[PDB]
Design a protein around this ligand. Sequence first.
Ligand SMILES: [Cu+2]
Length: 124
Amino acid sequence: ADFEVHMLNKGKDGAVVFEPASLKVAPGDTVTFIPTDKGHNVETIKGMIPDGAEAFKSKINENYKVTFTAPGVYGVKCTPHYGMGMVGVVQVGDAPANLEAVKGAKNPKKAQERLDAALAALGN
Ligand SMILES: [Cu+2]
């Protein structure tokens, strides 16, 4: 299955957001990060990707389709807007096994707040 996430200067949750900021998918599903507004990208957050996955980083303004295979939680950021909290979580499967590893990863405050909210929205 294929899902879409919009990269926005602003949205429901305020300044510099992924919409949605949380997404539950199955192994092998894809997510396309869409540069609806200019100036954004998507990058994995260190400490927030499960065993068997590979970190990535898209180019600014790249329409970017990512396959999520290994189960668990994936934290993503927009590289320039990470400090400002432009972050999201993609969760592959239920009962993610890397949850406490990812909860311990270090993030700047606005990012941490939005990451915790996305984790809670996903049932964690
Ligand atoms: Cu951004």
